[PDB]
Design a protein around this ligand. Structure first.
Ligand code: SF4
Ligand code: SF4
Ligand code: SF4
Ligand code: SF4
Ligand code: FES
Ligand code: CA
Lengths: 198, 588, 905
């Protein structure tokens, strides 16, 4: 099951262009450069993930280009203020295809605790979001888990190989949600450690 | 007499001096729980009173705060002049170790006060923020534009009739705002920003923002330049405004604590402490000693965390990108201890009215002992790696220097004020949370506040915080982690779980909110980045009638133009790296 | 009087006790057993203050502020250490046995005991022993019983027995085993038993209908509305959660219905939450029922109405003033027909003429309790206007009040007043076709047909004033009772005459008017009260129009090819066969309604109108007071497909689309201005509530409390994006907590009472100028008319006595508080409470027909034979058969009609 952007369609995938699509998706997902965009405390945990104690460099996501042209992924990590929302939209428009968006934190997800006059209630109001991370702030390993989720999201999506041959629309897989996938093991939890110890 | 008792402070010599100078009927003394004398002055005598306080034998030299209050919905105003709005001016005399809160009452139609900038230059941004959020006009202001909201914003958000919650989103507003973002570079007029003689034609205009590649936040600075020399500059702030005061008017006294966390998001419990202290002043709560030492422990841990991040970011801004990894590993050790104690990393939300959310977990002293053994070798390694380097010294020494007069007139606190040679720390001058029982030193500078002097003072403050943490680990009382007061929110959990009166208190405190009686309270503490303060006005309800958060990064950002005038852009970058500010602290 | 509380001087009323005087000053004293409407007994021992003998005194003495008069030169202290310690100790003694029940108790967040436990500062438990336990009782479908939570404050017994006159609730047991409840399991028989849930400061008595779908007070969306279940017009606070009407609380009005509702108004709201209600406009095409939005429905209805040659409109007394006026504007003044029958309209217009042209002051509901003698003629008040019956009970106890006041006993010392006035009471004379619920306190009861009750009234008026027409044919025993009534009424300082349109006789209203005029001619302070039937019966009478029979005649004759029925089921005012035939002959039937009625099967177009919880409007109660009710919630907030609008909005948009072929919905103030501009009789409805631009220091009025929760999750199952907050352009209220609900706010419409520290219904004490008095800035509602300068003439149409004719049976109306109102039977909680449909037979007539009690008899009315079981009625006069009005199959129009071939089936 896939979704078009130029519509809910099926999988269109001879065998040579199939292997080409898997190789292109593998190269895209194994080399994702985030854009260095500092908004709020969620970016502090993002750069905490960037340091040596968590090693986001292992996933090939450590180049951290200061220009949106050289970046493939926008990590909106912070509150979406009304003054900063045109800046976010302009920086998103400056990025080039393929582009993916990770919302980091409850502010970027939905506005979070700041349902206030000067905060846009979520970055999905004006730019599309690929991965959402709950948390305030999400811990750095949660950001790396969201990076892995984006990696398997990219790994089966279909994009044109060239701009002159083939269908130019972009396919995005309707993935099974992590909630229903993890419900089998989350409900079975019965006992946890008592909060009186270290 | 307890520290939270309502005092009129009529025995203060400033009251006698004001009575001798202006007369007994010239002002009204208000009894509060702020700890400072609150004096209601007539509007036409405001500048005279300010000048008289400025020319005292031990003068009031620093305008600590200046803001407004919407008094239209305040039912309990006994012993107060008739006011639709009010403007308050908090002034600190370091020589007396005293402070006074002047208050000017304004009617709804005549919402204008004389400007205070001819006495204190920080009144520029303070009055701009008062006009932006309350609509109060200050006559004689050089440029009274909106500082928090954009210029094309209708209404004033901190007024009581303004809706707090978010309005519906429209892509049309975003698209047109993208159009003004596009033509802002083309249609830039220096007269709008207060600059003069723009484009002689030897000056160019430079915009650094909106997004900087750093962790201090997102903001803009427009610079008037002759080649590489800065002649005029004003910072464009308000890009991080979250409506924290307006949120304080729509959350209960207990449910506002996570919002107090995110004021200075590198501070955490340091930001939680003045709020819960002021609420406990309103509630008449004296916390036990174990609560004091626990709060001191967590505040010093988060102070060390913030100082480590600040030193790392300053070193990275100089150009050395290596020690930030090791210092973030040290921050991970601190976060391990904080996760063990409070259950969270950055915003613990652990301080409570009357105590803390839980008792200390079994084994906290082990993690504290390992952290205290781990820290000093890493600190010496960072010192020898970067802060004794000659390139860093050449980049940092003598850059954006100011003296004691400039720090006093601009409200600069924290590392800069102590680097100017003035010994003023709230943990010693006006002690709080049982800080008198800890033996620690206050580092001061030679008299000139460079980047290097401020960074070394922060390193010495980290050393003293390690000393305080050692004293916390060695000497901790065994006792309650919550007060024995009926207004302790929430009550202890086991008594809630098996006693019905405690269950009733818990039920009504977590649902409707705890009822603070009608009073004004004020708590001023030494934050990780300067002096922080919470000014809370209660009307007798379960929410705050007015929450006023004074943060030092506002004063530092306003002192930015007065100190970098005549310097280079790289000097501006080093200065921005050496302030220890966050944009959430400025814009709140 | 001059008192000194905590060293501060205050001026108070010397006739008040110290508790109500200090609560009126804003001072906080905890209290349980005292109520403003019930007086002081000194039971709970919670209100202890420290009194001093004079200005210089340090010892003092703990006195009981509810039992201590606020005399001149009093010196008391509330914040004294011994007083505070004793109040905390009293709270602690109450909390020794209290169950650990707050999470699973319906009084949580609304509990006076919780508020006073917190306010005294008691939060530490040192009691370590057991807690006493009580079994519960089944009290019926409305009140849920939990005796463990009792604090033995005696409010329930005092209200239910001394105030409401009930007989089935009492206190039993002993020292600490005191049990408050019924002597056995069973339904609480009183018609005002629902006020126990607000009288009880704990969760012993709880709203069971609210408990079925329970939510806390902070989670409610409240509005100030008017109860729509009879003509009294009691002020209510409907509270909503998750798109359904959850509770009806009593909203304080110091002029009408101060602390108390009746059970029909408190538990009869369940028709709002019915799942068969129309939520979208529906057009019938052949056999299909297609669904339109608002614009296509307006365009299609306007097109079909434009092709019609004459469109008539049938209003209803269910609908508000604005809806009836909008229908009248759409169809024309000469084509507007009131939805009631000719006889009902004639009785309503006569009662209106007596009220606003008879020169006798009609009292408000609170003012009824100060009259010295009461004569109820024809009306069964407890089953039709129940709150008037409660006020009549208070007026009857006024004699004991006067007797105790003559002995210098304070008016709040209720036990001494009841001890002095043992059984002496003000005269109450009730007339009905059978026994009433006021008979336990009535000085005399007259069980007679409506003609005989009218003759009794005419004879009373003739004996009071000889110029009144006389009645010939009075028995000597009846004449003795007549002169007893006349001697009681003539010696009364403030006589009150209560009648209404529910008796089904014009002559009863004429006789009551004659009695009131005769008492006015003797210089007495006479008042007259007329009880109407529906919520806006007075408004439809004032606006006026043709009867339903004329509309059916126009539909049958073919002169009207389009009928617009507004909020009417058309079966309570006419025979069902005639209505069905007339509506089937009409080529267009268009029903604007919020309840699924039986006339929608033939309706060509159905407009999903709004009920009172989803609409704004004005209703005129029985005393002629215009009152605005406000929308509680947006029905389209949760279900975005729901297109349910106000009836006046629907009809104004239809008029605009018929005239200019364009859609304009309205604003509410525009319709109010149109009403006050075109109908000068209804010109007083403008001052019922301020317009939508009214603000309190620039901000609107909050519908929901400031701690309203779940804002980002209550609609998250539909969509994760939070929708727009609903905009209320019609009124001054906002559908959010971003508003003003301060007790000191200069307003009269209060959606709900809450003060910090007062979460219970005792926050109304903070919302009043003095406790137990009016609201601080006046009560909402404005009387439409003043009393006339000159009265009417005597009604000379004296009827003859009732003659039982052979083969015919006069239908005596029997009314029930649960069953007679149209909208209340739709509430599913009422079917457990409504009585079984009976037919009342006199023992002589039942013996003549050979029928026992319980056997089924079949009678044909309008050629329709229905069967009912027989109940033997001793007090029913022979030749009459008693039918329960307003039930299923028995229209209220059948009162006074004759019955044929009544025979056992
Ligand atoms: S979600 Fe929380 S941590 Fe992240 S930006 Fe918002 S306030 Fe900061
Ligand atoms: S009656 Fe009041 S105190 Fe008792 S369980 Fe219910 S809410 Fe709690
Ligand atoms: S049942 Fe309620 S009203 Fe009655 S005595 Fe007990 S607490 Fe009071
Ligand atoms: S007396 Fe009438 S108006 Fe009042 S609550 Fe009862 S049904 Fe409603
Ligand atoms: S309120 Fe006075 S003793 Fe109960
Ligand atoms: Ca409306």
């Amino acid at each position: 099951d896939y979704t078009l952007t130029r519509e809910i369609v099926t999988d269109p995938l001879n065998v040579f262009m199939g292997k080409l699509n898997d190789m292109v998706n593998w190269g895209r997902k194994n080399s994702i450069w985030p854009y260095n965009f500092g908004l709020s405390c969620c970016y502090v945990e993002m750069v905490t993930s960037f340091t040596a104690v968590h090693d986001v460099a292992r996933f090939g996501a450590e180049v951290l280009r200061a220009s949106p042209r050289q970046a493939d992924l926008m990590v909106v990590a912070g509150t979406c203020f009304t003054k900063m929302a045109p800046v976010i939209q302009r920086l998103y428009d400056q990025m080039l295809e393929p582009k993916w968006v990770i919302s980091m934190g409850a502010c970027a997800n939905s506005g979070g605790m700041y349902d206030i006059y000067s905060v846009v209630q979520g970055v999905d109001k004006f730019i599309p979001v690929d991965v959402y991370i709950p948390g305030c702030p999400p811990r750095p390993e949660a950001y790396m888990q969201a990076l892995m989720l984006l990696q398997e999201s990219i790994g089966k999506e279909r994009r044109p190989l060239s701009w002159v041959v083939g269908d130019q629309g972009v396919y995005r897989a309707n993935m099974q949600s992590e909630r229903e996938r993890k419900r089998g093991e989350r409900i079975a939890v019965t006992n946890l450690r008592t909060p009186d110890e270290i | 007499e307890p520290a939270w008792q309502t005092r009129d402070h009529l025995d203060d010599p400033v009251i006698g001096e004001l009575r001798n100078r202006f007369g007994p009927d010239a002002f009204t003394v208000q009894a509060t729980r702020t700890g400072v004398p609150v004096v209601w002055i007539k509007r036409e005598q405001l500048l005279e009173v300010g000048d008289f306080l400025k020319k005292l034998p031990k003068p009031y030299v620093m305008l600590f705060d200046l803001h407004g209050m919407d008094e239209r919905l305040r039912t309990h105003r006994e012993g107060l002049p008739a006011a639709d709005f009010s403007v308050f001016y908090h002034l600190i005399s370091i020589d007396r170790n005293r402070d006074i809160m002047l208050k000017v009452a304004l009617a709804e139609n005549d919402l204008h006060v004389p400007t205070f900038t001819k006495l204190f230059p920080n009144a520029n941004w303070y009055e701009r923020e008062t006009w932006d959020l309350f609509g109060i006009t200050f006559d004689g202001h050089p440029n009274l534009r909106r500082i928090m909201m954009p210029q094309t914003w209708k209404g004033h958000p901190l007024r009581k009739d303004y809706p707090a919650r978010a309005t519906e989103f429209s892509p049309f507003e975003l698209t047109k705002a993208k159009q003004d973002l596009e033509m802002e570079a083309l249609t830039f007029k220096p007269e709008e920003w207060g600059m003069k003689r723009g484009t002689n034609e030897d000056f160019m205009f430079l915009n650094l923002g909106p997004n900087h590649p750093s962790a201090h936040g997102a903001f803009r600075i427009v610079l008037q330049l002759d080649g590489e020399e800065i002649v005029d500059c004003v910072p464009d702030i308000g890009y991080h405004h979250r409506g924290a005061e307006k949120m304080g008017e729509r959350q209960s006294w207990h449910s506002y604590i996570p919002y107090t966390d995110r004021i200075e998001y590198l501070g955490g419990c340091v930001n939680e402490m003045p709020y819960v202290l002021a609420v406990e002043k309103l509630a008449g709560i004296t916390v036990p000693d174990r609560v004091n030492v626990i709060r001191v422990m967590l505040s010093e841990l988060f102070r060390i965390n913030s100082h480590l991040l600040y030193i790392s970011t300053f070193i990275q801004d100089v150009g050395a990108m290596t020690p930030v990894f090791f210092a973030f590993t040290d921050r991970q050790k601190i976060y391990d201890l904080v996760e063990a104690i409070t259950g969270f990393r950055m915003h613990p939300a652990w301080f409570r009215i009357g105590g803390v959310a839980h008792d200390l977990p079994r084994g906290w002293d082990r993690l504290l002992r390992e952290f205290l053994d781990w820290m000093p070798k890493r600190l010496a390694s960072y010192e020898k790696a970067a802060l004794q380097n000659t390139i860093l010294k050449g980049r940092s020494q003598g850059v954006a220097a100011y003296g004691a007069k400039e720090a006093l007139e601009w409200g600069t606190t924290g590392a800069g004020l102590r680097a100017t040679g003035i010994d003023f720390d709230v943990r010693k001058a006006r002690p709080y949370s049982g800080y008198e029982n800890f033996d620690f030193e206050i580092p001061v500078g030679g008299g000139v506040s460079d980047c290097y002097t401020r960074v070394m003072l922060k390193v010495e403050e980290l050393r003293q915080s390690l000393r305080i943490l050692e004293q916390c680990l060695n000497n901790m009382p065994e006792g309650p982690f919550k007060a024995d007061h009926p207004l302790t929110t929430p009550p202890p959990k086991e008594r809630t779980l098996q006693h019905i009166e405690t269950l009733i208190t818990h039920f009504l405190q977590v649902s409707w909110g705890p009822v603070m009686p009608a009073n004004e309270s004020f708590q001023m503490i030494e934050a990780t980045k300067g002096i922080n303060s919470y000014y809370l006005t209660s009307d007798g309800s379960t929410m705050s009638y007015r929450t006023r958060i004074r943060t030092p990064s506002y004063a530092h950002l306003q002192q930015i133009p007065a100190a970098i005038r005549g310097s280079l852009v790289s000097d501006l970058i080093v200065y921005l790296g050496s302030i220890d500010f966050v944009m959430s602290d400025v814009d709140r | 009087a001059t008192i000194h509380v905590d060293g501060k001087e205050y001026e108070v009323n010397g006739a008040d006790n110290l508790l109500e005087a200090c609560l009126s000053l804003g001072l906080d004293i905890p209290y349980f057993c005292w109520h403003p409407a019930l007086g002081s007994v000194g039971a709970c021992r919670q209100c202890a203050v420290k009194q001093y003998q004079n200005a210089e005194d340090t010892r003092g003495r703990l006195v009981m502020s509810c039992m201590t008069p606020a005399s001149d030169g009093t010196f008391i202290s509330i914040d004294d250490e011994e007083a505070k310690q004793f109040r905390e100790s009293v709270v602690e003694w109450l909390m020794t046995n209290h169950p650990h029940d707050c999470p699973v108790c319906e009084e949580g967040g609304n509990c006076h005991l919780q508020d006073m436990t917190v306010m005294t500062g008691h939060s530490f438990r040192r009691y370590r022993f057991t807690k006493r336990t009580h079994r519960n009782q089944d009290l019926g479908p409305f009140i849920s019983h939990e005796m463990n939570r009792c604090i033995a404050c005696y409010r329930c017994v005092r209200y239910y027995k001394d105030y409401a006159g009930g007989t089935d609730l009492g206190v039993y047991g002993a020292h600490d085993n005191v049990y408050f409840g019924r002597p056995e399991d069973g339904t609480l028989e009183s018609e005002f038993s629902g006020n126990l849930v607000e009288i009880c400061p704990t969760g012993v008595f709880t709203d069971k209908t609210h408990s079925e779908r329970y939510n806390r007070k902070w989670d409610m969306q409240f509005a100030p509305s008017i109860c729509q279940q009879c003509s009294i017009g009691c002020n209510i606070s409907p509270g909503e959660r998750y798109g359904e009407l959850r509770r009806i609380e009593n909203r304080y009005n110091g002029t009408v219905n101060h602390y108390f509702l009746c059970d029909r108004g408190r538990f009869g709201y369940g028709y709002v939450n019915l799942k068969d209600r129309p939520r979208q406009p529906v057009q019938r095409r052949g056999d299909d029922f297609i669904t339109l939005n608002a614009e296509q429905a307006m365009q299609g209805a306007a097109d079909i109405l434009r092709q019609s040659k004459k469109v008539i409109g049938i209003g209803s007394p269910r609908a508000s003033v604005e809806s009836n006026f909008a229908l009248r504007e759409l169809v024309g003044e000469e084509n507007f027909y009131t939805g009631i029958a000719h006889g009902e309209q004639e009785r309503l217009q006569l009662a209106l003429k007596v009220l606003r042209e008879g020169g006798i002051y009609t009292p408000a509901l609170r003012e009824i309790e100060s009259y010295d003698a009461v004569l109820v003629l024809g009306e069964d008040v407890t089953q039709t206007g129940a709150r008037v019956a409660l006020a009549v009970r208070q007026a009857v106890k006024g004699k004991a009040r006067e007797m105790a006041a003559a002995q210098k006993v304070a008016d709040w010392q209720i036990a001494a007043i009841l001890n002095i006035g043992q059984r002496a009471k003000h005269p109450l004379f009730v007339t009905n076709v059978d026994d009433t619920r006021l008979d336990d306190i009535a000085a005399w009861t007259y069980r007679a047909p409506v003609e005989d009750q009218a003759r009794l009234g005419f004879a009373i008026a003739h004996a009071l004033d000889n110029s009144a027409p006389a009645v010939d044919g009075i028995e000597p025993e009846l004449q003795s009772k007549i002169d007893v009534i006349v001697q009681a009424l003539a010696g009364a300082k403030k006589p009150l005459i209560i009648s209404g349109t529910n008796a089904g006789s014009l002559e009863v209203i004429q006789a009551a008017a004659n009695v009131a005029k005769a008492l006015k001619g003797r210089g007495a302070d006479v008042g007259i009260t007329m009880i109407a039937r529906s919520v806006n019966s007075m408004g439809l009478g004032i606006m006026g129009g043709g009867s339903l029979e004329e509309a059916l005649t126009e539909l049958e004759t073919g002169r009207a090819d389009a009928v617009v029925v507004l909020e009417n089921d058309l079966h309570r005012h006419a025979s069902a066969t005639r209505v069905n035939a007339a509506l089937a002959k009409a080529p267009l039937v268009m029903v604007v309604d919020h309840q699924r009625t039986a006339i929608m099967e033939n309706a060509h177009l159905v407009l999903s109108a709004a009920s009172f919880a989803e609409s704004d409007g004005t209703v005129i109660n029985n005393e002629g007071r215009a009152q605005r009710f406000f929308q509680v919630y947006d029905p389209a907030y949760y279900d975005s497909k729901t297109v349910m609008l106000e009836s006046w909005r629907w009809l104004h948009s239809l008029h605009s689309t018929l005239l200019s072929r364009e859609v304009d919905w309205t604003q509410l103030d525009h319709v109010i201005d149109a009403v006050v501009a075109k109908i000068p009789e209804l010109a007083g409805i403008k001052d019922a509530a301020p317009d939508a631009t009214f603000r309190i220091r620039g901000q609107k009025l909050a519908r929901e409390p400031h701690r309203y929760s779940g804002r980002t999750a209550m609609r998250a199952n539909i969509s994760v994006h939070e929708p727009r907050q609903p905009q209320d352009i019609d009124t001054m209220f906002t559908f959010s907590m971003e508003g003003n609900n301060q007790p000191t706010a200069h307003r009269s419409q209060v959606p709900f009472a809450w003060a910090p520290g007062w979460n219970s219904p005792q926050a109304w004490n903070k919302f009043q100028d003095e406790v137990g008095g009016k609201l601080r800035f006046g009560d909402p509602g404005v009387r439409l008319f003043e009393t006339s300068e000159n009265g009417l003439d005597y009604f000379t149409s004296v009827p003859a006595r009732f003659q039982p004719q052979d083969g015919k049976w006069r239908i005596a109306p029997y009314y029930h508080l649960f069953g007679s109102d149209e909208l209340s039977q739709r509430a599913p909680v009422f079917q457990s409470r409504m009585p079984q449909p009976y037919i009342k037979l006199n023992p002589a007539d039942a013996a003549k027909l050979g029928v026992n009690a319980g056997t089924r008899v079949s009678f044909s009315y309008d050629g329709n034979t229905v069967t009912l079981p027989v109940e033997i009625a001793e007090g029913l006069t022979a030749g009459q058969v008693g039918l329960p009005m307003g039930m299923s199959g028995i229209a209220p129009v059948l009162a006074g009609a004759h019955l044929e071939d009544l025979k056992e089936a």
